[PDB]
Amino acid sequence: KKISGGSVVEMQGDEMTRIIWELIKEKLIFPYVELDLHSYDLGIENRDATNDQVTKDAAEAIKKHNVGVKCATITPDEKRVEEFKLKQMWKSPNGTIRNILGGTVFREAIICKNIPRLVSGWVKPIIIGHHQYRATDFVVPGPGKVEITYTPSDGTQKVTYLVHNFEEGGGVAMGMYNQDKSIEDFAHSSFQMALSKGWPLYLSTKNTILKKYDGRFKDIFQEIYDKQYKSQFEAQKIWYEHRLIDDMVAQAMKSEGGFIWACKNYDGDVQSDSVAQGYGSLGMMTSVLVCPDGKTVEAEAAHGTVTRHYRMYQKGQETSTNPIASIFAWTRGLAHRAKLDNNKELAFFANALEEVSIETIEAGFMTKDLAACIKGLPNVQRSDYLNTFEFMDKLGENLKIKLAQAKL
Amino acid sequence: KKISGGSVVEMQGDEMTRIIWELIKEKLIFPYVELDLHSYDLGIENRDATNDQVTKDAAEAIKKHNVGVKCATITPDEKRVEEFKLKQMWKSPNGTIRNILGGTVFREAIICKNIPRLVSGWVKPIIIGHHAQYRATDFVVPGPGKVEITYTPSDGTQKVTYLVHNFEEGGGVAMGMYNQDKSIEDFAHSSFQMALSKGWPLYLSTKNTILKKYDGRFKDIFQEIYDKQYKSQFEAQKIWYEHRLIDDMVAQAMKSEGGFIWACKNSDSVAQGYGSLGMMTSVLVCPDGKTVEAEAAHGTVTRHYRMYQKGQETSTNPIASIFAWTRGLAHRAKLDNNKELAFFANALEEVSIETIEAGFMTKDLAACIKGLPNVQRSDYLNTFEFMDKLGENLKIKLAQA
Ligand SMILES: NC(=O)C1=CN([C@@H]2O[C@H](COP(=O)(O)OP(=O)(O)OC[C@H]3O[C@@H](n4cnc5c(N)ncnc54)[C@H](OP(=O)(O)O)[C@@H]3O)[C@@H](O)[C@H]2O)C=CC1
Ligand SMILES: NC(=O)C1=CN([C@@H]2O[C@H](COP(=O)(O)OP(=O)(O)OC[C@H]3O[C@@H](n4cnc5c(N)ncnc54)[C@H](OP(=O)(O)O)[C@@H]3O)[C@@H](O)[C@H]2O)C=CC1
Ligand SMILES: Cc1cc(-c2cnc([C@H](C)Nc3nccc(N4C(=O)OC[C@@H]4C(C)C)n3)nc2)ccc1F
Ligand SMILES: Cc1cc(-c2cnc([C@H](C)Nc3nccc(N4C(=O)OC[C@@H]4C(C)C)n3)nc2)ccc1F
């Protein structure tokens, strides 16, 4: 009866998202899909006990099965250690996975006709790809010479570059780098994303300023395009072009959306996440780690565990947490699984669940944050929204009807 | 009798803005104000004829007289070298001026109650200043090996060597960048001076959680300069200074109503995408608190100038160019304690906002309310009709006194 799903590496998480995650599987995934699930408990109470081995095991499993779906997890800080009696302030589970699997992170917001966009003209989502987190910075305490050097590993002559001669007083200095392989893995991930979506791709740099550094990004993309993708792109009526960041900002805002934007100097936490957080649309933002093979993906919600809401849930208070970015972690993983397995039944299910989600909201049934995008952050009434469990139920009902009406 | 405006440095420019700049002086400035006008022609052909000496002299004149008002200018590229048969690709005049004067550029959008904002909650303008990557040393790493950054103090008692990266698999790129304390101090002074001038609070944003040393130094110097030199001046005006992590600042700004100064350590391209470039001012604030260079945030508007050249009707927004004059004249009035000039510069800003708020505007403003496809010929005024309208309204405002 159920749809064959195939091999999927699941990762359980923490707090409010963990609550939502189970509701998704129980009400939206499992009644219709039978999966070869390879579940890992990346909850903090199990990550500490297993000495963050569950995190390492989860990562190797995604490499093996090619499809990973991750719940949001608590990234440990000093204050969290007192709450769980933590044996160590462990690494970020996402940092660990990214270091193991590699690849480019692509962000995408979920668009609904009745939910205003920051730029009203955006009817189709904009997808942003990006690799200062690698920088080595320090204080210069007084006069002296700061130099940056390259020492070949083969014993040949080191090359010296003067950064600055501080004649009077001190200041600050830093060194940054990028590996050709990382730039190549980013070009491949971006060209494959544009083909898998049927949208054009743009790369933005400041190669007029950082002529060598950014010039290398522009040349690598172009080299990979012309030799491995130009024909495949031209046979989909789409394209690839390099843009200076200034022209790209303006172009993006005058656009209708529906393009891929490979952004070199990009701070996703700020330019996407913080803007989304301030706009009140974090619950509608998705993230997908796309490895250079074109086979390995790890899909997740761009947001965190939603701690504030989880506390109200513990304190017996009613919550209205948006589950869409969480559902879309599942739908994006299942869509990629279907692509690999040539599974038309699974490809349809992933498509139908995304549509039910968009359609329910468009029909007037939504969580508090979505109601706030319409009415204004402080202007929501209880009658404007459905709570966490109420919304999941409405999605469930609409998913049933939609799947029954599709046979014909 | 006309107002005695005093010493003002003016820089004439290029293409569409040159046409607007001359209309502003003839129609809005010269009928009410007399100036001891130090006028420099930064038109591309004059910069070429003088080997860019006019640009350096204009900057020297701003330093001497403290007030500069600048028209947009062509920055030569390959296509411009050919178009004007230039002796060489002359450097940006703005770069030359900024290099000679020093200081921080603050951008500010002009708000009208009938004109939609990107974030509707912003009912008051946000003033943004960036620290100004351009003094970096970047290179290509040909293959495996170590990239290290070293500091050697002048005495020679020490040497610290930091690993940037040990390239183990192939090549890539690397770069080194720096900031002198003086440059950070100057940025703090301009920022505190801007906040004191507007009577608005100031926020410094950095990524000090990641660049703990590099950005922590910006955080430390701003706090130290504030505590010793500005804290009492801020308390007297009931304003405040605070540091913010960039992530929190962006979220906070999105939820804000505006009316603050934002010193950014990491707008006009956002204004261009939005279709509001003609409503954005730009002001270079020197750390001395005496020298100011005011201009529109936009360029010469070449696309519109080609239309004007071909007889075709143009609807170029002149407000940002007007606000370059009002801002410079208001600073001149403050340095000289000239109530009449202060009154004039403020009234010209009010007239501008009132005219737009009464439904008399340019195509870009009409497109902001309605959207460019739905814009009908009658929804907007052309450059010249709009300038005449502002002129009529200015005469009335000034007559009612
Ligand atoms: N990939 C991952 O695993 C990530 C994990 N985290 C972790 O999550 C924890 C909490 O982080 P925090 O800074 O609060 O970031 P969150 O994204 O969890 O929450 C930030 C705020 O944005 C709003 N928001 C986010 N998602 C939703 C949603 N689905 N529905 C409704 N509103 C939403 C809420 O606003 P309001 O409070 O106004 O309701 C929320 O408190 C930390 O322990 C952190 O380590 C953080 C980022 C990523
Ligand atoms: N400070 C300075 O002196 C600056 C000079 N420049 C110079 O200006 C020239 C033109 O550059 P360009 O890239 O076109 O940048 P511009 O800012 O001159 O124009 C870009 C576009 O923005 C819109 N726009 C800008 N100003 C106005 C206005 N006042 N009213 C209505 N719309 C406006 C128009 O859009 P639309 O086409 O959709 O109508 C315009 O074509 C170049 O030679 C460049 O070097 C550039 C920036 C600053
Ligand atoms: C101009 C410009 C844009 C962006 C940018 C950032 N993040 C996205 C996300 C991944 N996708 C998307 N797609 C459609 C709508 C939409 N959003 C929306 O309406 O409000 C909320 C959210 C975003 C503004 C966060 N977000 N797109 C573009 C980045 C730099 C820039 F300079
Ligand atoms: C956090 C954040 C901030 C900013 C931003 C950019 N530029 C400014 C300028 C200097 N001032 C100002 N002030 C009030 C309104 C306002 N504008 C407005 O509403 O539409 C037109 C114009 C600008 C968006 C061009 N512009 N302010 C804020 C942008 C995105 C963000 F995500």
DSSP label of B29: I
* Residue of A357, A367, A370, A369 whose CA lies nearest to A389: A367
Per the CB < 8 A criterion, the answer to whether A365 and A112 are in contact is: no
Beta-sheet pairing, A159-166 with B292-296 = unpaired
**Single-letter amino acid code for the residue at A24:** I
Cβ distance of B165 and A177 shorter than 8 Å:
yes
10 Å CB burial of residue A22 (0-12, 13-18, 19+) is exposed
* Residue of B305, B256, B27, B174 whose CA lies nearest to A179: B174
Give the span between the Cα atoms of A70 and A57, in whole angstroms.
Answer: 13
Write out the DSSP string of A193-231.
HHHHHT--EEEEE-TTTSTTHHHHHHHHHHHHHHHHTHH
Per the CB < 8 A criterion, the answer to whether B252 and B244 are in contact is: yes
Beta bridge partners, A104, equal: A290
Per the CB < 8 A criterion, the answer to whether A351 and A14 are in contact is: no
Whether B374 has its CB under 8 Å from any CB of chain A: the answer is no
Residue A11 tokens read as: 């990762």
Ligand 2 pocket residue status of B97, Cβ below 6 Å:
no
Judged by DSSP in three states, B352 sits in: helix
C-alpha distances out from residue A62 to A10, A57, A101, A187, A224, Å: 9, 9, 8, 22, 26
Domain count, chain A: 1
**Longest Cα separation, chain B:** 78
Give the span between the Cα atoms of A181 and A204, in whole angstroms.
Answer: 18
Beta-sheet pairing, A3-12 with A33-41 = parallel
Per the CB < 8 A criterion, the answer to whether B136 and B175 are in contact is: yes
Residue A377 tokens read as: 């952050």
Residue A164 tokens read as: 């600055």
Residue A183, domain extent: 1-408
Phi, psi of B104 (to 5 degrees): -120, 140
Residues in chain B: 401
**Single-letter amino acid code for the residue at B85:** K
Experimental resolution (Å)? 2.2
* Residue of B75, B86, B62 whose CA lies nearest to B14: B75
10 Å CB burial of residue B334 (0-12, 13-18, 19+) is middle
What number of other Cβ atoms are within 10 A of residue A159's Cβ?
A: 15
The H-or-E segment that residue A29 falls in is none
Residue A274 tokens read as: 């913080």
**Alpha-carbon dihedral sign for residues B380, B385, B390, B395:** negative
Give the span between the Cα atoms of B295 and A380, in whole angstroms.
Answer: 43
Dihedral, CA of residue A314, residue A369, residue A77 and residue A87, to nearest 10? 40
* Residue of A126, A258, A130, A266 whose CA lies nearest to A185: A130
Per the CB < 8 A criterion, the answer to whether B131 and B98 are in contact is: no
Question: ∠ CA B347-B352-B353 to the nearest 5 degrees?
Answer: 100
Give the span between the Cα atoms of B147 and A153, in whole angstroms.
Answer: 10
Write out the DSSP string of A351-372.
HHHHHHHHHHHHTT---HHHHH
The H-or-E segment that residue A241 falls in is strand A240-244
How far does residue A192's CA lie from ligand 3's centre (Å)?
21
C-alpha distances out from residue B32 to A151, B296, B394, Å: 68, 22, 10
Cβ distance of B177 and A178 shorter than 8 Å:
no
Ligand 2 pocket residue status of B277, Cβ below 6 Å:
yes
Judged by DSSP in three states, B80 sits in: helix
Residue B213 tokens read as: 């040393």
Per the CB < 8 A criterion, the answer to whether A346 and A337 are in contact is: yes
**Distance from chain centroid for Cα B296:** 7
Phi, psi of A112 (to 5 degrees): -125, 135
**Single-letter amino acid code for the residue at A353:** L
| Residues A38-75: b if buried by 16+ CB within 10 A, e if exposed | bebbbbbeebbeeebebbbebbebbbebbbbbbbbbbb
Give the span between the Cα atoms of A360 and A371, in whole angstroms.
Answer: 13
Cβ distance of A137 and B211 shorter than 8 Å:
yes
Give the span between the Cα atoms of A217 and A140, in whole angstroms.
Answer: 30
Q: Extract the runs of DSSP E, i.e. beta strands, from B91-248.
A: 104-109, 126-130, 137-141, 145-153, 160-167, 172-180, 202-206, 241-245
How far does residue A116's CA lie from ligand 2's centre (Å)?
29
First to last CA, chain A: 17
Per the CB < 8 A criterion, the answer to whether A107 and A325 are in contact is: no
C-alpha distances out from residue A89 to A13, A17, A307, Å: 17, 21, 18
Looking at all shown ligands, the one closest to residue A93's CA atom is 1
Write out the DSSP string of B161-203.
EEEEEEE-SS-EEEEEEEEEHHHHHHHHHHHHHHHHHHT--EE
Q: Which residues contact B153 (CB under 8 A, 6 or more apart)?
A: A141, A142, A143, A144, B159
How far does residue B112's CA lie from ligand 4's centre (Å)?
14
Chain B partners within 8 Å of A181 (Cβ): 169-170, 172
Chain B partners within 8 Å of A159 (Cβ): 139
Residue located nearest, by CA, to atom 28 of ligand 4? B126
Residues in chain A: 408
Per the CB < 8 A criterion, the answer to whether A84 and A44 are in contact is: yes
User: Which experimental method was this entry solved with?
Assistant: X-ray
User: Closest partner residue to B250 among A141, A216, A278, by Cβ?
Assistant: A278
Write out the DSSP string of A52-121.
THHHHHHHHHHHHHSEEEE---PPP-HHHHHHHT-SS-PPPHHHHHHHHH--EEEEEEPP-TTS--SSTT
Give the span between the Cα atoms of B204 and B129, in whole angstroms.
Answer: 10
Per the CB < 8 A criterion, the answer to whether B94 and B52 are in contact is: no
The H-or-E segment that residue A242 falls in is strand A240-244
Give the span between the Cα atoms of A139 and B176, in whole angstroms.
Answer: 14
Q: Which residues contact A70 (CB under 8 A, 6 or more apart)?
A: A11, A13, A42, A93, A94, A97, A298, A299, A300, A329
CA distance A123 to chain B (A): 14
Per the CB < 8 A criterion, the answer to whether A38 and A7 are in contact is: yes
Give the span between the Cα atoms of A84 and A80, in whole angstroms.
Answer: 7
Per the CB < 8 A criterion, the answer to whether B196 and B290 are in contact is: no
Whether B146 has its CB under 8 Å from any CB of chain A: the answer is yes
Atom of ligand 1 lying closest to residue A368 CA: 31
Interface test with A, best of B123, B134, B135, B148 (most A CBs within 10 A): B148
DSSP label of A126: -
DSSP label of B113: T
How far does residue B225's CA lie from ligand 4's centre (Å)?
28
What number of other Cβ atoms are within 10 A of residue B366's Cβ?
A: 22
Give the span between the Cα atoms of A288 and A286, in whole angstroms.
Answer: 7
Question: ∠ CA B283-B288-B293 to the nearest 5 degrees?
Answer: 25
Judged by DSSP in three states, A270 sits in: helix
Q: Extract the runs of DSSP E, i.e. beta strands, from A245-284.
A: 260-263
Per the CB < 8 A criterion, the answer to whether A227 and A220 are in contact is: no
User: Closest partner residue to A278 among B179, B182, B253, by Cβ?
Assistant: B253
Residue located nearest, by CA, to atom 22 of ligand 1? A277
Residue B11 sits in a domain whose CATH number is 3.40.718.10
Judged by DSSP in three states, A173 sits in: strand
Judged by DSSP in three states, B21 sits in: helix
